[PDB]
Amino acid sequence: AESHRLYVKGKHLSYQRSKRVNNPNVSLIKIEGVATPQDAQFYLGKRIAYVYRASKEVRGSKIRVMWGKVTRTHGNSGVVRATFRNNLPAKTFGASVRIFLYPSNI
Amino acid sequence: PHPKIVKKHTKKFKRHHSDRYHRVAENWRKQKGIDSVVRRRFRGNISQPKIGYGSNKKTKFLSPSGHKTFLVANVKDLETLTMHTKTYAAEIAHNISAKNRVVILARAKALGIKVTNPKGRLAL
Amino acid sequence: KWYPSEDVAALKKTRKAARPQKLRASLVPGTVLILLAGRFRGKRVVYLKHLEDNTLLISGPFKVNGVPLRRVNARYVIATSTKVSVEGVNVEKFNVEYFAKEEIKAERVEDQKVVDKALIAEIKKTPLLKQYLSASFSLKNGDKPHMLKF
Amino acid sequence: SDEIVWQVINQSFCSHRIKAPNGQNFCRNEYNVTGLCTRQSCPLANSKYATVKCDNGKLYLYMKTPERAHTPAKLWERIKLSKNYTKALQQIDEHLLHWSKFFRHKCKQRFTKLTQVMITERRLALREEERHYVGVAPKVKRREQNRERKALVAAKIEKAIEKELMDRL
RNA sequence: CGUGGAGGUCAGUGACGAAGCCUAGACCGUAAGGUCGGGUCGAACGGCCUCUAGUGCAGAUCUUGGUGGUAGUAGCUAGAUCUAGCGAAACCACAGCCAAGGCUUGG
RNA sequence: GGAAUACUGCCAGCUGGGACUGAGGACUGCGACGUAAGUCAAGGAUGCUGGCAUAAUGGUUAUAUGCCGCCCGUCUUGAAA
RNA sequence: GAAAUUGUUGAAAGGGAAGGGCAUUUGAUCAGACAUGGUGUUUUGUGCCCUCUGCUCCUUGUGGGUAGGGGACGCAU
């Protein structure tokens, strides 16, 4: 096919933060097409994978990934807190985060 | 096996202003100045040592690989470990020569004890 | 057959029994499953048997889209609504052991053709449902899997 | 009496005791089970005791009692033990009879371990003839490096090459 | 916990390299501290149980030594203000682009 | 006249989705279902299956980016300077 | 042969600051088992096993130590 995308796309935004103290445990995620929390409830628990490049070829491929889940809803507009294993670099606020579809429970 | 080994705090504490001065060293010491920021614990300053960091009596003193450490000199000394090969692992005090290490090695594999620091002073 | 020789702690009685799996409502054999993960990702296969290790079994049928007989975990699969008829297909010929392992073992191929024929012949009873298992699946633009109905 | 000999060993020092970096302190006596000098394993304060020990032969169960307490040159009795792990264990819990559970429980273990040790040492006797360990003294190092450096320096190494090539021409 | 010496004890360790110092190596201690791996070095040294002190450093316009910034400066010997050569000190927590609240909010 | 619906409530009613933890380490206890033997969701988690030794992963480091933190000590504590 | 302090070579950032705290990122970089078995089952030699024959010391006991002639439980295969 032309389009093999199996994953909704999204934007990384912030770490969770107070007005001053951030808490870079849990990235906050914006999801494309979710405008509302009850839309979120579908996504909670899928596997987010942040994907980027490294010019030094590591495993035989220069494309690297961090994985992680999506835990709970955030705010009324449908931000969704995700926590990766190794926290997102904060180099990327507003970079495209991919939200796969599985675990699949419907 | 053993529980999962958790340090509670893995970063060595440094002495306030250690780096801005050499005449001050890196070994933690208290701040007795009643005005100081590190003593009164203002936000954003270094973290004191305090008891709550004390680790888990189960896994305390455990080296990562899961054994403990016990520090031996001659073979007659490691023979105390015939019993515990599952808890203690023994390593070879620095001043041992390269003559006797190889002995503690051979005999320490026969007993099946883990030596944390083989390869010290020994080529092939 | 020695004595424990260095004493350890005996376990306690673990009170957690092993109780059989409860599949979700939307899986009954013959659903068209879309895969999610694996080299076969995003394809469309047919759900036949629910094995005993808590995974499903799926066939392409390999004659069509390339997916052979395979064991596949329940959670990574999306369950469509479009049924078929499995009833004229044998089942029990294989289970966890048939997939235990240690190129191709000609037997495996044989079974492949066996289920192949009958099953495909069943599929030909529906229009286009032949192709619909050939083509891959993918989100298109604007697609909103929280609004979709599979 | 014995509890005193203990408490003396638990405040003053034994000739032998270790105090590993964690809180616990071994007992390096040749004769004891468990190798930790604590009330019930320290052979010096018991007066009734039994261990297992290799001779370079098989594994003699050594025993003592109160009665030879004053006659050390011969205090420890001794027994050999079979090559049947099964029969061994039966010999051990045989001789020990109403000796309390400690020594059957543990002595059995020391037997198991030393037997395994034997078996290993037997394997390792048969293995890896190759690549022995070796040390190199420090001044051996220093000497080698320098003398090498001078070796190269002495050979301008191209003059040889070219002159050999003019040769070949 | 650590430092100097002492009385025991490890039949402790040591020219096959003791101390010491370096370390973008490791582990242990919550921490004081500890223990190993490389590297340089050359002759003594350490752990446990106890004794005894001239025993623990950031400060003292601290003492003594070494160094700097100040600066090749202010300047003073050959050459025609220039050049060459020679060469200080006072002072030094740090560093000094704005404006209003007195770090913050703007430029 | 006759039902219904919202509102506040009740349930020792049913059921789906997600997260974080798995402390303890023979048995003893309280129990529930059992014809009984036994069973069990009852005094703290187990099973299955995947990846790995030119390992898996782990670290130190210099930088990066996000937010936070100004110069220490003494002395009148109060423009706390 | 330490530090302060300086030179060179390389790294890295910088143009308006250095330093610290929580967290990952990227680069470099280092470590990363003489693990190589276990439970059996069989074939076959040998001997501390079997059967003869002794000898010895003493805590004289449900003990050690040891020799020779042979034969088929530990060990090797």
Curated annotation (Swiss-Prot), chain A:
InterPro entries: Ribosomal_eL33 (IPR001780), Ribosomal_eL33_CS (IPR018266), Ribosomal_eL33_sf (IPR038661), Transl_B-barrel_sf (IPR009000). GO terms for molecular function: structural constituent of ribosome. Keywords: Acetylation, Cytoplasm, Isopeptide bond, Ribonucleoprotein, Ribosomal protein, Ubl conjugation. It is found in: Cytoplasm. It holds the Pfam family Ribosomal_L35Ae. Its main location: cytoplasm. N-terminally acetylated by acetyltransferase NatA. The modification N-acetylalanine is found at residue 1. HAMAP family: Ribosomal_eL33. There are 2 genes for eL33 in yeast. Component of the ribosome, a large ribonucleoprotein complex responsible for the synthesis of proteins in the cell. The small ribosomal subunit (SSU) binds messenger RNAs (mRNAs) and translates the encoded message by selecting cognate aminoacyl-transfer RNA (tRNA) molecules. The large subunit (LSU) contains the ribosomal catalytic site termed the peptidyl transferase center (PTC), which catalyzes the formation of peptide bonds, thereby polymerizing the amino acids delivered by tRNAs into a polypeptide chain. This is Large ribosomal subunit protein eL33A. The gene is RPL33A.
From Swiss-Prot, chain B:
GO terms for molecular function: structural constituent of ribosome. One of its GO terms (cellular component) is cytosol. The modification Phosphoserine is found at residue 36. The keyword Ribosomal protein applies. Keywords: Cytoplasm, Phosphoprotein, Ribonucleoprotein, Ribosomal protein. It comes from the Eukaryota. GO terms for biological process: cytoplasmic translation. It is found in: Cytoplasm. Belongs to the eukaryotic ribosomal protein eL32 family. Component of the large ribosomal subunit (LSU). Mature yeast ribosomes consist of a small (40S) and a large (60S) subunit. The 40S small subunit contains 1 molecule of ribosomal RNA (18S rRNA) and 33 different proteins (encoded by 57 genes). The large 60S subunit contains 3 rRNA molecules (25S, 5.8S and 5S rRNA) and 46 different proteins (encoded by 81 genes). Component of the ribosome, a large ribonucleoprotein complex responsible for the synthesis of proteins in the cell. The small ribosomal subunit (SSU) binds messenger RNAs (mRNAs) and translates the encoded message by selecting cognate aminoacyl-transfer RNA (tRNA) molecules. The large subunit (LSU) contains the ribosomal catalytic site termed the peptidyl transferase center (PTC), which catalyzes the formation of peptide bonds, thereby polymerizing the amino acids delivered by tRNAs into a polypeptide chain. PANTHER family: 60S RIBOSOMAL PROTEIN L32 AND DNA-DIRECTED RNA POLYMERASE II, SUBUNIT N (PTHR23413), RIBOSOMAL PROTEIN L32 (PTHR23413:SF1). This is Large ribosomal subunit protein eL32.
Swiss-Prot record, chain C:
This is Large ribosomal subunit protein eL6A. It comes from the Eukaryota. It comes from Saccharomyces cerevisiae (strain ATCC 204508 / S288c). Present with 37100 molecules/cell in log phase SD medium. There are 2 genes for eL6 in yeast. One of its GO terms (biological process) is cytoplasmic translation. SUPFAM superfamilies: Translation proteins SH3-like domain. One of its GO terms (cellular component) is cytosolic large ribosomal subunit. N-terminally acetylated by acetyltransferase NatA. The lineage of its organism: Eukaryota, Fungi, Dikarya, Ascomycota, Saccharomycotina. Component of the large ribosomal subunit (LSU). Mature yeast ribosomes consist of a small (40S) and a large (60S) subunit. The 40S small subunit contains 1 molecule of ribosomal RNA (18S rRNA) and 33 different proteins (encoded by 57 genes). The large 60S subunit contains 3 rRNA molecules (25S, 5.8S and 5S rRNA) and 46 different proteins (encoded by 81 genes). Belongs to the eukaryotic ribosomal protein eL6 family. CDD domains: KOW_RPL6. Gene3D superfamilies: 2.30.30.30. PROSITE patterns: RIBOSOMAL_L6E. One of its GO terms (molecular function) is RNA binding. Keywords: Acetylation, Cytoplasm, Isopeptide bond, Phosphoprotein, Ribonucleoprotein, Ribosomal protein, Ubl conjugation. PANTHER family: 60S RIBOSOMAL PROTEIN L6, LARGE RIBOSOMAL SUBUNIT PROTEIN EL6. InterPro entries: 60S_ribosomal_eL6 (IPR000915), Rib_uL2_dom2 (IPR014722), Ribosomal_eL6_CS (IPR049633), Ribosomal_eL6_KOW (IPR041997), Translation_prot_SH3-like_sf (IPR008991). It is found in: Cytoplasm. Pfam families: Ribosomal_L6e. The modification Phosphoserine is found at residue 5. The keyword Electron transport does not apply.
Swiss-Prot record, chain D:
Belongs to the MAK16 family. It is found in: Nucleus. A motif (Nuclear localization signal) lies at residues 138-143. One of its GO terms (biological process) is maturation of LSU-rRNA from tricistronic rRNA transcript (SSU-rRNA, 5.8S rRNA, LSU-rRNA). Keywords: Cell cycle, Nucleus, Repeat. Its role might be as part of the apparatus concerned with the nuclear events of the cell cycle. This is Protein MAK16. GO terms for cellular component: nucleolus; preribosome, large subunit precursor. It comes from Saccharomyces cerevisiae (strain ATCC 204508 / S288c).
